[PDB]
């Protein structure tokens, strides 16, 4: 289990998806044309996880770029690291999805899905040992949301034993393209509850607040939001992209993070938040990454309880000081960590730091407080759905109101399920 297959779907999916390949390609010493120009052998030791090797010793990302319109995929190819991607893996329709889940899942995206799967099969075939699939998308638009979850369902049919993880960007009125986002998100959440092993709930509400309140950016662009997302995507892939004596694949990590199958929606975090000169001390990284203000999902962890935590520290620091600080927050805030999963906070350290920071920490929290995210989207949904508002866009593509009622019910069940373990 070494090779991961990456799929990025829709505008958001391809935007954060591009930023991922930019950040890690720098970290592995790969230039915009795919040639290695590093120095440490640690940069090439597990390069096979995300890159295929080509003739002339070129490295090509194991990446598939999906969209229902060309606009954003033309922008990726023009962008800084656009040339590195395999041309055959650019799979795109023409008519778009108009921020419509139904178009993505049932009509327009149905027409394009099989050709995306042929490319997935092409990449999966020449994989010594495929550990799983990772996906980037938003849940609020049409393509990444509707088509991305259709793909996820298809991938599970053909590869039912492989791990499926997502970075799923959640919609928010604060950073909002259209009024129908809650509809699209609710339909998508139900897909993710059934068909993924881990979903990193990137909340645009939270990313905006971090940019506004804690970074002093008055008018945050999607670039400012995506900078925070890319640091976290780098963070959660560190322990697969490098050593250091940790012998874990996606399944092993999944086994240790997911105590119940439907409850696999994580609350990511990062320290320090940037947009520096003084490196942070280990106590600062620890207190910052556990702070609500640094959470990428707009939930208050004091309103729930942690099922599991993972934390991956980067940089040259004392592993003794890390153990001590991690034990310090647990033993001084032990009410918020469930007592019925002993030793639920686990930690790793990686010597290679990311570009620009002398030391950092990525936080992966499986907390029952994530119900607040789902409650918020459920309230936005019902506000419209009780008057059947904007439904004609969906019934026009063949959907019944029944399917909305079902999805509403599935998400309120998820919320109830989280509430169960918060009181246990």
């Amino acid at each position: 289990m070494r090779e991961i297959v990456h799929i990025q779907a829709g505008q958001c999916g391809n935007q954060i998806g591009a930023k991922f390949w930019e950040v890690i390609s720098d970290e592995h010493g790969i230039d915009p044309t795919g040639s290695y120009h590093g120095d440490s052998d640690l940069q090439l030791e597990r390069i096979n996880v995300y890159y295929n090797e080509a003739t002339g010793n070129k490295y090509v990302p194991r990446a598939i770029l999906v969209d229902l319109e060309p606009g954003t995929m033309d922008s990726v190819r023009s962008g800084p690291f656009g040339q590195i991607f395999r041309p055959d893996n650019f799979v795109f329709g023409q008519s778009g999805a108009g921020n419509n889940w139904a178009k993505g899942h049932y009509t327009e995206g149905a027409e394009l899905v099989d050709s995306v799967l042929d490319v997935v099969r092409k990449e999966s075939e020449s994989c010594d040992c495929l550990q799983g699939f990772q996906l980037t998308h938003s849940l609020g638009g049409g393509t990444g949301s509707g088509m991305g979850t259709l793909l996820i369902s298809k991938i599970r049919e053909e590869y039912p034993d492989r791990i499926m993880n997502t970075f799923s960007v959640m919609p928010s009125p604060k950073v909002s393209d259209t009024v129908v986002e809650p509809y699209n998100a609710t339909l998508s959440v139900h897909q993710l509850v059934e068909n993924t092993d881990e979903t990193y709930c990137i909340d645009n509400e939270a990313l905006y607040d971090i940019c506004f309140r804690t970074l002093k950016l008055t008018t945050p662009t999607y670039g400012d939001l995506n900078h925070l997302v890319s640091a976290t995507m780098s963070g959660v892939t560190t322990c697969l992209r490098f050593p250091g004596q940790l012998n874990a694949d996606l399944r092993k990590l999944a086994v240790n993070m997911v105590p119940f199958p439907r409850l696999h929606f994580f609350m990511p975090g990062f320290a320090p938040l940037t947009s520096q000169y003084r490196a942070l001390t280990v106590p600062e990284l620890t207190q910052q990454m556990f702070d609500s203000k640094n959470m990428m999902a707009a939930c208050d962890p004091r309103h729930g309880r942690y099922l599991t935590v993972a934390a991956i520290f980067r940089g040259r620091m004392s592993m003794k000081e890390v153990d001590e600080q991690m034990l310090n927050v647990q033993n001084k805030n032990s009410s918020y960590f469930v007592e019925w999963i002993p030793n639920n906070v686990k930690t790793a350290v990686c010597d290679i730091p990311p570009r620009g920071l002398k030391m950092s920490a990525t936080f992966i929290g499986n907390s029952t407080a994530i119900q607040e995210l789902f409650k918020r989207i459920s309230e936005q949904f019902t506000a419209m759905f009780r008057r059947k508002a904007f439904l004609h866009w969906y019934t026009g593509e063949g959907m019944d109101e029944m399917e909305f009622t079902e999805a509403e019910s599935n998400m309120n069940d998820l919320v109830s399920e989280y509430q169960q373990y918060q009181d246990a």
Binding site: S153, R156, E157, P160
Partner: protein, 53 residues
Amino acid sequence: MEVIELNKCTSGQSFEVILKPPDPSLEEIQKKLEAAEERRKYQEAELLKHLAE
């Protein structure tokens, strides 16, 4: 405290000192490995049946 059964040799010695006196078959294993594979294959069938709907 009696020092009994002293045995010596060129690489060492040993003694005792007393301070005071007073499985299933190859059928059943291959059977229940395969019964777990039935449940594994029935669960995968239930999934591919669900995804077919």
